Amino acid sequence: PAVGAAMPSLDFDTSVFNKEKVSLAGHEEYIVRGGRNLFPLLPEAFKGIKQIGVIGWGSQGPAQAQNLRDSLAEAKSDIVVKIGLRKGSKSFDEARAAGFTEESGTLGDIWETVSGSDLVLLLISDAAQADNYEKIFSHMKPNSILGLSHGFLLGHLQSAGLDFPKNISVIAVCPKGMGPSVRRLYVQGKEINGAGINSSFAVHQDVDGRATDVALGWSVALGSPFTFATTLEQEYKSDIFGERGILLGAVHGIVEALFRRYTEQGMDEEMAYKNTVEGITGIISKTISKKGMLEVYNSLTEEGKKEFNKAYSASFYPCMDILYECYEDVASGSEIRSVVLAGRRFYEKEGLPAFPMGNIDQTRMWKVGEKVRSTRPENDLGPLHPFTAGVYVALMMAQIEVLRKKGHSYSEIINESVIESVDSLNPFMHARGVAFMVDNCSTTARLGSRKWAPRFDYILTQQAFVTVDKDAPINQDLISNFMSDPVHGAIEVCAELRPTVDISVPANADFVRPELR
Amino acid sequence: AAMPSLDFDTSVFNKEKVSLAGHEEYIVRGGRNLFPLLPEAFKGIKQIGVIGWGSQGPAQAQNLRDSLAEAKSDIVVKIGLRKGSKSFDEARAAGFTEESGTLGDIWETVSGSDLVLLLISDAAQADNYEKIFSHMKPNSILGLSHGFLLGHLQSAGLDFPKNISVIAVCPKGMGPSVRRLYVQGKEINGAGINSSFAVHQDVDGRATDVALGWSVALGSPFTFATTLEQEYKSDIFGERGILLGAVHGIVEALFRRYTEQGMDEEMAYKNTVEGITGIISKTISKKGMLEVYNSLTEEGKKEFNKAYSASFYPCMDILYECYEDVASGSEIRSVVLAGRRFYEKEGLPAFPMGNIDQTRMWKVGEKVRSTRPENDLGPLHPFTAGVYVALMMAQIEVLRKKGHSYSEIINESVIESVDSLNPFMHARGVAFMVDNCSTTARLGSRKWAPRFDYILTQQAFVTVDKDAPINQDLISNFMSDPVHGAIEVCAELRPTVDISV
Numbered sequence A: 001p002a003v004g005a006a007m008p009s010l011d012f013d014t015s016v017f018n019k020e021k022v023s024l025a026g027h028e029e030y031i032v033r034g035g036r037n038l039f040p041l042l043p044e045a046f047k048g049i050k051q052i053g054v055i056g057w058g059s060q061g062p063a064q065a066q067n068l069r070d071s072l073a074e075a076k077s078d079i080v081v082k083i084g085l086r087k088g089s090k091s092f093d094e095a096r097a098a099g100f101t102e103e104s105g106t107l108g109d110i111w112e113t114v115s116g117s118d119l120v121l122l123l124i125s126d127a128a129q130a131d132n133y134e135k136i137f138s139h140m141k142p143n144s145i146l147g148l149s150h151g152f153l154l155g156h157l158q159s160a161g162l163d164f165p166k167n168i169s170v171i172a173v174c175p176k177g178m179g180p181s182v183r184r185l186y187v188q189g190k191e192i193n194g195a196g197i198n199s200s201f202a203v204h205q206d207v208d209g210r211a212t213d214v215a216l217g218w219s220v221a222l223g224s225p226f227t228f229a230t231t232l233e234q235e236y237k238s239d240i241f242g243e244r245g246i247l248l249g250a251v252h253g254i255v256e257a258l259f260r261r262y263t264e265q266g267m268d269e270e271m272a273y274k275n276t277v278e279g280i281t282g283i284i285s286k287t288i289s290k291k292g293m294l295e296v297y298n299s300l301t302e303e304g305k306k307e308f309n310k311a312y313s314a315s316f317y318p319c320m321d322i323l324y325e326c327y328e329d330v331a332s333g334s335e336i337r338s339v340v341l342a343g344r345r346f347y348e349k350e351g352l353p354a355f356p357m358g359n360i361d362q363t364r365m366w367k368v369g370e371k372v373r374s375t376r377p378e379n380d381l382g383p384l385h386p387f388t389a390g391v392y393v394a395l396m397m398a399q400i401e402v403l404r405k406k407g408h409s410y411s412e413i414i415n416e417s418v419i420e421s422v423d424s425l426n427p428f429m430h431a432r433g434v435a436f437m438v439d440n441c442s443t444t445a446r447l448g449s450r451k452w453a454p455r456f457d458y459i460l461t462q463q464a465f466v467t468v469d470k471d472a473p474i475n476q477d478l479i480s481n482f483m484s485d486p487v488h489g490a491i492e493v494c495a496e497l498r499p500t501v502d503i504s505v506p507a508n509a510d511f512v513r514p515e516l517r
Numbered sequence B: 001a002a003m004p005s006l007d008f009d010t011s012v013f014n015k016e017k018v019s020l021a022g023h024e025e026y027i028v029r030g031g032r033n034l035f036p037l038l039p040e041a042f043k044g045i046k047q048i049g050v051i052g053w054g055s056q057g058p059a060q061a062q063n064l065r066d067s068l069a070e071a072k073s074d075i076v077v078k079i080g081l082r083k084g085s086k087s088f089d090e091a092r093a094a095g096f097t098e099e100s101g102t103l104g105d106i107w108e109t110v111s112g113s114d115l116v117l118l119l120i121s122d123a124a125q126a127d128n129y130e131k132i133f134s135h136m137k138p139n140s141i142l143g144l145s146h147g148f149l150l151g152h153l154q155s156a157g158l159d160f161p162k163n164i165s166v167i168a169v170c171p172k173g174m175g176p177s178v179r180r181l182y183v184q185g186k187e188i189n190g191a192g193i194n195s196s197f198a199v200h201q202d203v204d205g206r207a208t209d210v211a212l213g214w215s216v217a218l219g220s221p222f223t224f225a226t227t228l229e230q231e232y233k234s235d236i237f238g239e240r241g242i243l244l245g246a247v248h249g250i251v252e253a254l255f256r257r258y259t260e261q262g263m264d265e266e267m268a269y270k271n272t273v274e275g276i277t278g279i280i281s282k283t284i285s286k287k288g289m290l291e292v293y294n295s296l297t298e299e300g301k302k303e304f305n306k307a308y309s310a311s312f313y314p315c316m317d318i319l320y321e322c323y324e325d326v327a328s329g330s331e332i333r334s335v336v337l338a339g340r341r342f343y344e345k346e347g348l349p350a351f352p353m354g355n356i357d358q359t360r361m362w363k364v365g366e367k368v369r370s371t372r373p374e375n376d377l378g379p380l381h382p383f384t385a386g387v388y389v390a391l392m393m394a395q396i397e398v399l400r401k402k403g404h405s406y407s408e409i410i411n412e413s414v415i416e417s418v419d420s421l422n423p424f425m426h427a428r429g430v431a432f433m434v435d436n437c438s439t440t441a442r443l444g445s446r447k448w449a450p451r452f453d454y455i456l457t458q459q460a461f462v463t464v465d466k467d468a469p470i471n472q473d474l475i476s477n478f479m480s481d482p483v484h485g486a487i488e489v490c491a492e493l494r495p496t497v498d499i500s501v
C-alpha cells in the first residue's frame, strides 16, 4: 500500500532576487532567472560571508571556483574564493594555472580553508564525502554554511541514521549539467546575456535566515539560466537515478542493443552506428531540444510513424521495469551504499586487488564509431531512424512516468529526463562516443552508467525486441497516452527558459577533465 | 584474510573431521540407518510446524513425515498455510489433513509447534516476521532453509527474539529434487541432497542436535557446518556468481564473440553452452579443474591461459562488487523491493519477471537440442574453458578472502554448478536452470548476468585482441592453488548418484 503520490511544489523566501511563478501542466512552481546584470545583488546575497571555500578540483571544482572568482569581481566585493586541496595533490596546479595561488590567499590546504570559510563548497568525490564527513564537520566554522552540489551525503547520513550538524547551515546548488559544461557556457555568456547551466537549489537547514539567498546568489554566480527549488532528499533520488537512466546508463544500453539488432538483420556496421548513436545525439536530441517529442513523431513518414509506434509500444514497459527498480535502489539507500563501497574498492584491501573503472568504449561498435566520425562532415546531424526514435522516446517517457509517480516536480523531471540529456550530455557522445560523455561526469555517474547500462541492453533484447518480432498488436492506450501526455506542453514552457545558445563541444576540448583532453 | 574454523557440540550424533587445504572442518554423515536417533535428537519436540507449501515446503514435510515414521516417533508434522491459500487441497492429496491434525492455519501451527520451519518465500519472511516471532513459544525453535531473514533483520539493526533458538538447515538443491532423491534413497544408499547447517541462537542447548536431526531427516547424505551470516552471504552471492548469474553472462558474451568472428551459430552454441554444461562440468565433477587444463592439447593450453589471464580479474571485479552488496544489506533490500514490484503500487504497473530464453542464441540452442544425440556432452573448447575456470577461480578467491570455509566455497563455487545446476541448462537451456530456482535466485541471475557479459566483452575480450602477454603468476596461482586438493577431498563427501534430470 498504496497507490498514488502527488507533486510537492516547494515555495522559498527570497529578499534579494526576483521569485517567478511558472505554470507546468497546471502545476505552480517557483524559479529565479539568472543573468550577468544580477551580479550587483551578490553582496546583498552574500552578507555574513567573508571567504568562500571551494574544496576539491575535479569536475565541478574548476568550473564553480572560476565562475565564483568572476562575477565578484564584476560586483566588486571583498569576499575571497579559496581552493582547498590535500597535501601533494595531483590536481594542485592546475589551480595555479587557473589563477589560484598560495601567494594571493586563493589556494591552500583543505582544512585551513574549511575552518576559515563562512561558505564551504564540498566539491569532492561523493564517496569521499561519505567516508570523511566527520573530519569535515569538525573543521567547520561555528554558525557557517555548507554548500553541496549533490544530495549524496544526506542519503548516506540517513542510511547511517544521522544528520548534518545542527550548528551549521546546509544548502545545495546542483548544476543540471556536467562540470565542463558549466564553465563552457560562461565563456559563451560573457558576450551574450544568457548562457549557462540550469540548476536546482535546496535549503536543508537554515541557521539564521541567510541560507536561501546564499544558495540563490551562488546559483546566479555560476550563470544558471533558471534556478528551480528542490530538497536534498529529492535531488539525490532524482540525480543518482537520472545518470543511471536516460542521461548515461539507459541511452548506452539502448544504443548497444539496437546496434546489435540491426547488424544481425543484415545492416552493415557503419549505417547501424549512424541509425543509433548519431541519430539519437543528432536530430532527435536537437528536435526534442527545440520542439519536443511529438515533433519527432510528426516529421516521420507514414511508414516511419508505424515503426515508431511498434518500437514505443514494445519498449515502454521493459524500460520502466529497470527504471522502477533503479529508483527504489536509490531511494532506499542501497545504491548510495554501492557507490561508497565501489569507491573503497579502487584501492587494495583485505588481500584483494584494486579495481579502478575500466574502459567502456573499446568494444566492436565504438571502433565503428571511430571510422564513422573520421570521414564525417562538420555540423552533421545523422539519419533519423523511425524504430530508433520509438525506443529512445519510449525510454524518455518511461523515466518521466517513474519520477512523476514518485512525486517530483515537473522542472526536476524535465531537466533530469529531457533537458540535460538533449542539451548537455548527448553532444559529447556525438563528438567522441560514449566514454567522452560518461567519463566526463562524476565518479558516481560513471559507476552508475557502468552498472545499469547492461540492464537496459538485456531488457530490450529479451523483451522489447521479442515483442516486435512476435508481431504483437500495438498497445493503443500507450500510444494514445504518449500523444496527450501533459509533459509535452510542460517541456514547451521549460524550453522558453533554456539559454538560447547551443553548447559547442569540439573534439579536442580543453575545458573537459584534464585526462581526456 | 580470516578463516572460519567452525566447531559445534553434538551429544547424539557422530561428528567426523576433514582437512581441506590445511584447514580443519567437522561433518555429519547421514543415512536411513540414523533415524532411530531422531527421537533423542528432537528431545523436547512434540510437533514440527512446516510453514509454506511451495518448492521446499512439500518436500521437507514429506521427508520429515517419512523418517519418523522409521523412528516410530509421536512427533506431528503439521502444515501451516494462510487463510486464503490455494495449496490446501494439494496438501490433502499428500496426506496432510485436519482430521489427523497435520494441516492447519499458519498461526495456529506456529503457536503449537516446538520446531517451526519457515519455508515460505523470502519476500514473505521479510514482510511478516513480526507476527511470526510473537507466535513463537518461549524456548521453541525457528528453523530456516536460508539466511535471508537474518540479513534483512541485520540490515535494519534488528535480530531474532532472545527467548527463541534459531537454527538453519539448507539443502544444496531445489525442492522437487530433495524429495525425488529421498525416495530413491530408500532403494539405493547415499542418494539425496547435501545440506549445510547453522546455529544462530541456542537458549537451552538443544538447538545443535535438533538442526542435525532435521538435516538427516531430510535425507542429507552429508551435513556441513556454517554460520547463518556466512550462509546467506555465500548463497545469495553464489547464485549471482557461477551458479546462475555469471555462467549465463559469460555464455552470452562468448557466443556473441564466436558468431561475430564468423563461426556457425549452432557450432558457437556447442562451443559455449553445451561444452560448459556437459563435458567441462563432467570433467570438473569427476576430476577437478586441473583435469580440464591437462586434458587440452598443447595449443589449446596456450588458448586456455590466454582466456584465463584475460578473464580472471574482470570476473573478480563483478563478483567482488556483488558480494559486498550482499554483505552490506543492499542486495537483500533489492530483492524485497523487487518482490513488492510484482504487484501494482504507487500508480505504477506490476512488473513480474519476464522470459530470458527467447533471444537469438537460445532459439539456436533449441535447434541444436532437437537433433542432438542422447549421450552427447558437447565439445571441449579451450578458450571457453579458460573463461569458465577463470570465473570459478575468481569466485573461490573472493569468498576465500571474505572468510568463508572451504566446504562452503567448494559447494557454492564448484559442486552445485557442475553436478546440480549446469545439467539443467544442458537439458533445456538457461530458463530451465534459472527459473527452477528460488525467487531470490531468479532475481539474482537477471540482475547480474548482464554485468558479467559487459565486463567480459569490454575488458577480457579486448585484452585477448590486444595480444597482451599472459599474466604468468596468475596462471601459476591456478596451477598451484591448494583448493584443487580440497576439491578432491570434498568430492568424496558427495551424494552417491545423479541429480541430472
Ligand SMILES: NC(=O)C1=CN([C@@H]2O[C@H](COP(=O)(O)OP(=O)(O)OC[C@H]3O[C@@H](n4cnc5c(N)ncnc54)[C@H](OP(=O)(O)O)[C@@H]3O)[C@@H](O)[C@H]2O)C=CC1
Pocket (backbone or CB within 6 Å): A056, A057, A058, A059, A060, A061, A085, A086, A089, A090, A091, A092, A122, A123, A124, A125, A126, A128, A132, A149, A150, A152, A174, A175, A176, A177, A178, A179, A180, A440, A441, A442, A443, A444
Ligand atoms: N562531475 C560532474 O559533472 C557533476 C558533479 N556533481 C556533484 O558535484 C560534486 C563534485 O564532484 P566532481 O566535481 O565530480 O569531483 P569528482 O567526483 O571527480 O572527485 C574528484 C575530486 O575529489 C577530491 N577527493 C577525492 N577523494 C578525496 C578525499 N578522500 N578527501 C578530499 N578530497 C578528495 C580529489 O582531490 P585531488 O585533486 O587531491 O585528487 C578531486 O579533486 C559531487 O558530489 C557530484 O555529485 C554534480 C553535477 C555534475
Ligand SMILES: NC(=O)C1=CN([C@@H]2O[C@H](COP(=O)(O)OP(=O)(O)OC[C@H]3O[C@@H](n4cnc5c(N)ncnc54)[C@H](OP(=O)(O)O)[C@@H]3O)[C@@H](O)[C@H]2O)C=CC1
Pocket (backbone or CB within 6 Å): B052, B053, B054, B055, B056, B057, B081, B082, B084, B085, B086, B087, B106, B118, B119, B120, B121, B122, B124, B128, B145, B146, B148, B170, B171, B173, B174, B175, B436, B437, B438, B439, B440
Ligand atoms: N526454492 C529453492 O530451490 C530453495 C529455497 N531455499 C530457501 O528456502 C526458503 C523457502 O523457499 P521456497 O521453498 O522457494 O518457497 P517459495 O518461494 O516457493 O514460497 C511459496 C510459498 O510461500 C507461501 N507464501 C507466500 N507469501 C506468503 C505470506 N505473505 N505469508 C505466508 N506464506 C506466504 C505461499 O503460500 P500460498 O500457497 O498461499 O501461495 C507458498 O506456499 C527460502 O528462504 C529459500 O531461500 C533454499 C534452497 C533452495
Ligand SMILES: [Mg+2]
Pocket (backbone or CB within 6 Å): A175, A176, A177, A239, A243
Ligand atoms: Mg547530474
Ligand SMILES: [Mg+2]
Pocket (backbone or CB within 6 Å): A150, A239, A240, A243, A442, A444, A445
Ligand atoms: Mg550525480
Ligand SMILES: [Mg+2]
Pocket (backbone or CB within 6 Å): B172, B235, B238, B239, B416
Ligand atoms: Mg545455493
